[PDB]
Amino acid sequence: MYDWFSEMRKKDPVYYDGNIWQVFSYRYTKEVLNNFSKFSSDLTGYHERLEDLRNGKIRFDIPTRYTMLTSDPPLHDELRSMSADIFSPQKLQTLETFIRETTRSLLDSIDPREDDIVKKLAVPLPIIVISKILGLPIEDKEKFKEWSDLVAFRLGKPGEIFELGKKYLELIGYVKDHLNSGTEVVSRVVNSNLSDIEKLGYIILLLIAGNETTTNLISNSVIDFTRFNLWQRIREENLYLKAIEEALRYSPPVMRTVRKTKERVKLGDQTIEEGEYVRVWIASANRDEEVFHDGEKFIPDRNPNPHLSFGSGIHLCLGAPLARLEARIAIEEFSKRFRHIEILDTEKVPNEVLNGYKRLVVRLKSN
Ligand code: HEM
Ligand SMILES: Brc1ccc(-c2c[nH]cn2)cc1
């Protein structure tokens, strides 16, 4: 896919295909993400329905349509300010011990003759941590994996990232049943003046939305380090942080995101009408030569590395510090426990926005 990115970057970085607008270069990507007053995140009509949600006129709707992810200021800032302290680096550092012991406990269950590190390490780790942070118990190990998988690009429903159905109704039920069992962040949302619909939305978003993406950051990291044979340079030169930032730049777990225009705007020398959808290719922008020298080479100590894999502007990923911390510990521990890694079989995640592996079968040499 990167092949096409390169050519669109050179010949056509702002491109209308007759359907929607697409952006490929770093400069125009960054400006669409930052300029919240011209490029809206309100894809589900959250602002337009806010009053009727709160006053009860809307009795039923899909809770995950009305979260901070699909809102603009001030509503976005108001929603986000309720949990921003919890996910900041300062507060998360508390958790470094829990993550490190959970990681090790997981590395134990691995069979080095042959195992799937997606199934034994990459999938469980984010689920266990977010559950700790939120105070919600993992009743069924299996249904958390399933619910985590409900996250997906839905065609025709922009800004919707959850697949619906009976699995979804279960998620909602489970959340109602544990409302009053949560930690600090959950209490704040519950006691707030949000509608019940928004509360469910808020919690489900935090519980679920970040699992698969983190799983993918871990897997992509393992893959990239192996294929370019960097495992021992990364370790002897202690490059975990900058290496993982490079995995993020090179193999982003989220490939693209979308905005809608609030008004006629001029992006480069194109004119986008008011009301158009603008698809922003994070993955292409992460390799724009104008910003990254040798953009198609993986460079584990790269610096500076201002990639957009967590986005930019007011929606910059709430979970970015958490994701960096989980990834880094997991790599480190893995890296000290095994020294030779052979990749036997892979299965990519087959869909288009999310970029990772469903299976990653390896054989390992342990120390
Ligand atoms: C490698 C892991 C992750 C990646 C690559 C990633 C990527 C992103 C991106 C690109 C956005 C921007 C959305 C947009 O502007 O349209 C975003 C926003 C967001 N992410 Fe993540 N994410 C990751 C992990 C997490 C985790 C662990 C959490 C929470 C537990 C999380 C929760 C959120 C939330 C709540 C937003 C919306 C924040 C706002 O709108 O102000 N993500 N993420
Ligand atoms: Br589709 C799609 C699925 C998940 C995300 C996300 C960003 N941060 C945590 N999860 C974004 C888009």
Swiss-Prot record:
GO terms, molecular function: heme binding; iron ion binding; lactoperoxidase activity; monooxygenase activity; oxidoreductase activity, acting on paired donors, with incorporation or reduction of molecular oxygen
pH dependence: Optimum pH is 8.5 for peroxidase activity.
Any one annotated GO CC term: cytoplasm
E.C. number: 1.14.-.-, 1.11.1.7
Essential cofactor(s): heme
InterPro entries hit by this protein: CYP450_119-like, Cyt_P450, Cyt_P450_B, Cyt_P450_CS, Cyt_P450_sf
Matches recorded under SUPFAM superfamilies: Cytochrome P450 (SSF48264)
Effect of residue 213 to S: 5-fold reduction in styrene epoxidation activity. No effect on thermostability
Substrates-to-products reaction catalysed: 2 a phenolic donor + H2O2 = 2 a phenolic radical donor + 2 H2O
Keywords attached to this entry: Cytoplasm, Heme, Iron, Metal-binding, Monooxygenase, Oxidoreductase, Peroxidase
Residues binding heme, per UniProt: 76, 80, 257, 259, 315, 317
Cofactor note: Binds 1 heme group per subunit.
Domain of life: Archaea
Record note on temperature dependence: Optimum temperature is about 75 degrees Celsius. Activity is 10-fold greater at 75 degrees Celsius than that measured at 25 degrees Celsius. Thermostable up to 85 degrees Celsius. Thermal denaturation midpoint (Tm) is 91 degrees Celsius.
Outcome, altering residue 213 to F: Loss of styrene epoxidation activity. No effect on thermostability
The keyword Metal-binding is assigned to this record: yes
Heme is among the record's keywords: yes
Family: Belongs to the cytochrome P450 family.
Function noted in UniProt: The endogenous substrate is not known. In vitro, catalyzes the H(2)O(2)-dependent epoxidation of styrene, cis-beta-methylstyrene, and cis-stilbene with retention of stereochemistry. Is able to use cumene hydroperoxide (CHP) or tert-butyl hydroperoxide (TBHP) instead of H(2)O(2) as the electron acceptor. Can also hydroxylate fatty acids such as lauric acid.
Annotated NCBIfam families: Cyp119_Thmprot
Protein name listed in UniProt: Cytochrome P450 119
Organism whose genome encodes this protein: Sulfolobus acidocaldarius (strain ATCC 33909 / DSM 639 / JCM 8929 / NBRC 15157 / NCIMB 11770)
